[PDB]
Amino acid sequence: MENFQKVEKIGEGTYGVVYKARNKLTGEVVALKKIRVPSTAIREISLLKELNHPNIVKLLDVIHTENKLYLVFEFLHQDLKKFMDASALTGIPLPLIKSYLFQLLQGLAFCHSHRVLHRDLKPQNLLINTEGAIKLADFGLARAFVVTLWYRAPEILLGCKYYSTAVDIWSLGCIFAEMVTRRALFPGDSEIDQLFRIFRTLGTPDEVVWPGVTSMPDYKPSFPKWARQDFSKVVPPLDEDGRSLLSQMLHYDPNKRISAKAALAHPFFQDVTKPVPHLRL
Numbered sequence: 001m002e003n004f005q006k007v008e009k010i011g012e013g014t015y016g017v018v019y020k021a022r023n024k025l026t027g028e029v030v031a032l033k034k035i036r037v038p039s040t041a042i043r044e045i046s047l048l049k050e051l052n053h054p055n056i057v058k059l060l061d062v063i064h065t066e067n068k069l070y071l072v073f074e075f076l077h078q079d080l081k082k083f084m085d086a087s088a089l090t091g092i093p094l095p096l097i098k099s100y101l102f103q104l105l106q107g108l109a110f111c112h113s114h115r116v117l118h119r120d121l122k123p124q125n126l127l128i129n130t131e132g133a134i135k136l137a138d139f140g141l142a143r144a145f146v147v148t149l150w151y152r153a154p155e156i157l158l159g160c161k162y163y164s165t166a167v168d169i170w171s172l173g174c175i176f177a178e179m180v181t182r183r184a185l186f187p188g189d190s191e192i193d194q195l196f197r198i199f200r201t202l203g204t205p206d207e208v209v210w211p212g213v214t215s216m217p218d219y220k221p222s223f224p225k226w227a228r229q230d231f232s233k234v235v236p237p238l239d240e241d242g243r244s245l246l247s248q249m250l251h252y253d254p255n256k257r258i259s260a261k262a263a264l265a266h267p268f269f270q271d272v273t274k275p276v277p278h279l280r281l
């Protein structure tokens, strides 16, 4: 703590406040996260600094002193939420959307292969730099330890306590649609409102499309029954390749939902390139 000179407060996270800080020693600029300490967390967090991938925000150090916990992450200047706000008028170019989705899927495939889940993916957690790269931040913290519910998977909202890697694919699918249309896909303001907004778009799930759904802890036979909408109306003007991938990312049944690995081979990415975005820092 004493070894860092806090510059600015980057923002309040799910498990603590994040500050832009300068390592008074090395002089390097980093992201200092003050965790708002169990031995389990310590061990879990420790394994995370071993995970290294170009599309994952690197956990540099873990400072456990005076019974306090500080996580030191690599620093990136902008998150996707701010970039989207800045591109509100023209929207993000499709080539850049495709590049970002491609890199994010690589990041997830890597984490998923190590059995590490994010569980709370959202625009605020996706950081970008001037080189055209995008990285996932806060990976694996959920397991170690006005909340947005917009990117929450159906199985989580229905009471399933043993979620899988599929929950991250759902969140990513929601973010994908948002970049294309420039509007949140399911902006619920409560757990039931979130669930109903999903049902009104993709249809109320039943035993046909999702075996075992009526046995979920929070499922109620009294749920209204809405018909499914066509994706052409939900995410215009995404082409057929894109709509195809999106539908596979938003399948109700977690077991039918596409994996990050398989999505990487989807036809939507046949013409992927790596454009450099115009960032205003």
Ligand SMILES: O=C1Nc2ccc(-c3cnco3)cc2/C1=C/Nc1ccc2c(c1)CS(=O)(=O)C2
Binding pocket: 010, 012, 013, 014, 015, 018, 020, 031, 033, 057, 073, 074, 075, 076, 077, 078, 079, 082, 083, 124, 125, 127, 137, 138
């Ligand atoms: O560079 C960074 N590393 C991080 C590690 C974790 C988190 C985080 C998020 N929620 C909880 O934890 C964030 C970072 C991080 C931040 N850099 C950064 C730096 C500046 C700005 C933003 C983000 C947002 S903006 O409005 O675009 C300005």
